[PDB]
Amino acid sequence: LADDAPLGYLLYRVGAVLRPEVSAALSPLGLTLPEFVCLRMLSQSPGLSSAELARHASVTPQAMNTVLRKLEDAGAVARPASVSSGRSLPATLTARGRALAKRAEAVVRAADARVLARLTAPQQREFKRMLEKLG
Amino acid sequence: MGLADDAPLGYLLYRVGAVLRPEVSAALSPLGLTLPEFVCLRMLSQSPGLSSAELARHASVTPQAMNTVLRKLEDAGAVARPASVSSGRSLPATLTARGRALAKRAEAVVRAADARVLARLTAPQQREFKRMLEKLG
Ligand SMILES: O=C(O)c1ccccc1O
Ligand SMILES: O=C(O)c1ccccc1O
């Protein structure tokens, strides 16, 4: 049928507008979108599985694991001691990574503002309320 | 408070998608379709011969999985790649009559599933919301 736009398709197109602008906004900080996903979500949920991080970042779990290894090698994500056990604590942000995540969150906030700029301010607030009500 | 604190737009969009996908899949199940197969059907119904990569991106799946979906729909008589009648090439993937009828039923149930996800906004909020989605995309 020629006149079919399902909700999932509309969401995907908003995403297709959004992801390149978020990437371009993150580029001056040396970050990709999956790295920002990893940083912020790890700042909210320590040790969150690579599978869910990959699901959120629209990447394969292998690619998200490479993201994790790079952020760990760069000193942004640490798995600390856990002096009681033989295994480490859930993956967590360092001071390096938390300052990094704060700047990335500023830049991503601005990028979302530029994507939302095709609506009026009340339309933007109402649209965000609808998104929160749907999710 | 919680995970939604200072939630970026991509995270909120992902949350709506996370509500929507199980309901769409459950709605598609009685027709023998998965979500990736339906995405493939609809997109092929409007754009013949679309690369497996783009179909996979739209279905949020790997290109390998989308190639399996393609074999699946072709084996089921919904998607044909017929031989070129006088060259030797293979024609772009398009829907057959059976694939078009299949897509008509699938789009009916998917529309209903979207209605159930949208039921958490009022009807005017539904119209507003979909127009806003259209302007954002
Ligand atoms: O039609 C789509 O492209 C789609 C995508 C994701 C979820 C549900 C959908 O109908
Ligand atoms: O923060 C996210 O989870 C996100 C996901 C996709 C695109 C942009 C984003 O900020």
Numbering used by the authors:
A (entry chain B): 3 to 137
B (entry chain A): 1 to 137
Would you copy out the relevant sentences from the publication that reported this structure?
Rv2887 functions as a transcriptional repressor; binding of effector molecule SA, or its structural analogue PAS, to the binding pocket of Rv2887 induces conformational change in its DNA binding domain, shrinking the distance between the α4 helices and preventing binding of Rv2887 to the promoter region of Rv0560c, triggering the expression of this SAM-dependent methyltransferase. Each subunit is composed of two functional domains: helices α1, α5, and α6 form the dimerization domain, and helices α3 and α4 form a helix-turn-helix (HTH) DNA-binding domain.
Two molecules of SA/PAS bind Rv2887 in two deep symmetry-related pockets at the dimerization interface, where each ligand interacts with residues from both protomers. Rv2887 binds both SA and PAS in the same cavity surrounded by helices α1, α2, α3, and α5 from one protomer and helix α1 from the other protomer. Residue Arg42 of Rv2887 forms two hydrogen bonds with the carboxylic acid groups of SA and PAS, and residue Asp114 interacts with their hydroxyl groups via a water molecule bridge. Residues Leu20, Val24, Leu35, Phe38 and Val39 of one protomer interact with the phenol group of SA/PAS by van der Waals interactions, and residue Gly10 of the other protomer stacks to the phenol group plane. The hydrogen bond distances between residue Arg42 and the carbohydrate group of the ligand in the Rv2887-SA complex are shorter than those in the Rv2887-PAS complex, possibly explaining the higher affinity with which Rv2887 binds SA compared to PAS. The protein conformations in the Rv2887-SA and Rv2887-PAS complex structures are identical, with Cα atoms having an r.m.s.d. of 0.42 Å. Specifically, binding of SA or PAS causes the DNA binding (wHTH) domain to rotate up towards the dimerization interface by 15~20°, and the N-terminal to rotate forward to the ligand binding pocket.
